[PDB]
Scaffold this active site. Sequence first.
Site, short mmCIF file in Angstrom:
data_model
loop_
_atom_site.label_atom_id
_atom_site.label_comp_id
_atom_site.label_asym_id
_atom_site.label_seq_id
_atom_site.Cartn_x
_atom_site.Cartn_y
_atom_site.Cartn_z
N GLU A 35 26.37 -59.19 -43.71
CA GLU A 35 25.61 -58.42 -44.62
C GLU A 35 25.38 -58.97 -45.88
O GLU A 35 24.24 -59.01 -46.18
CB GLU A 35 26.06 -56.66 -44.69
CG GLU A 35 25.85 -56.14 -43.16
CD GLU A 35 24.44 -55.92 -42.87
OE1 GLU A 35 23.21 -56.12 -43.48
OE2 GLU A 35 24.11 -55.50 -41.39
N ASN A 46 13.34 -54.41 -48.63
CA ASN A 46 12.51 -54.42 -47.20
C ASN A 46 11.03 -53.96 -47.66
O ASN A 46 10.70 -52.78 -47.73
CB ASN A 46 13.26 -53.58 -46.23
CG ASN A 46 14.62 -53.83 -46.03
OD1 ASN A 46 15.15 -54.75 -45.58
ND2 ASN A 46 15.40 -52.99 -46.54
N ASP A 49 8.95 -51.37 -45.08
CA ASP A 49 9.02 -49.84 -45.44
C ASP A 49 9.29 -49.46 -46.75
O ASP A 49 9.52 -48.22 -46.70
CB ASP A 49 9.85 -49.46 -44.07
CG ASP A 49 11.49 -49.44 -44.75
OD1 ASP A 49 11.68 -50.43 -45.30
OD2 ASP A 49 12.39 -48.82 -44.14
N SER A 51 11.98 -49.48 -48.32
CA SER A 51 13.64 -49.18 -48.54
C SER A 51 14.35 -50.31 -48.91
O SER A 51 13.85 -51.63 -48.98
CB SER A 51 14.09 -48.59 -47.16
OG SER A 51 14.34 -49.73 -46.47
N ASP A 53 18.36 -52.12 -49.28
CA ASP A 53 19.72 -52.24 -48.63
C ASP A 53 20.54 -52.71 -49.90
O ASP A 53 20.36 -53.49 -50.68
CB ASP A 53 19.94 -53.19 -47.78
CG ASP A 53 19.06 -52.86 -46.37
OD1 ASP A 53 18.97 -51.88 -45.93
OD2 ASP A 53 18.49 -53.90 -46.01
N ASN A 60 21.45 -48.61 -46.22
CA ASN A 60 19.81 -48.26 -46.61
C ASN A 60 19.65 -46.98 -47.27
O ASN A 60 20.14 -45.95 -47.05
CB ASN A 60 18.96 -48.66 -45.29
CG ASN A 60 17.67 -48.33 -45.50
OD1 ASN A 60 17.03 -47.40 -45.28
ND2 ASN A 60 16.88 -49.79 -45.56
#
Length: 130
Positions: A35, A46, A49, A51, A53, A60
């Site tokens: 990750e 991202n 969408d 959002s 991380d 998220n």
Amino acid sequence: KVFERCELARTLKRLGMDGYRGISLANWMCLAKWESGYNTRATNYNAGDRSTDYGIFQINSRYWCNDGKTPGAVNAAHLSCSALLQDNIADAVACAKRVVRDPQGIRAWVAWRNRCQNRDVRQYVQGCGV
């Protein structure tokens, strides 16, 4: 902060991650590794969408932390996303524990399924004294 492998393993152990909801420490190590490279500062936007991380576990903002700019989000962890960017990972661990309390468990992270599921993950904790 960028953790060294065994330093993180011991930290996770002390925070009670070993066997949490049936997930071994090595699995959590595998997850942090793919990750973020064990980096608490990591952030990934991202575009898709809108959002983001956050942190060592790449949690998220649509569901688990509030960053205010994510459309139609929830804050299941009821935390500011800023808390996931600290050097101290206590908050990020409390958040990751909440995430796996849902039925998908660790499967919530697609990276886990890609890089860790059905693999020999002993490698991530070898020689750390955990």
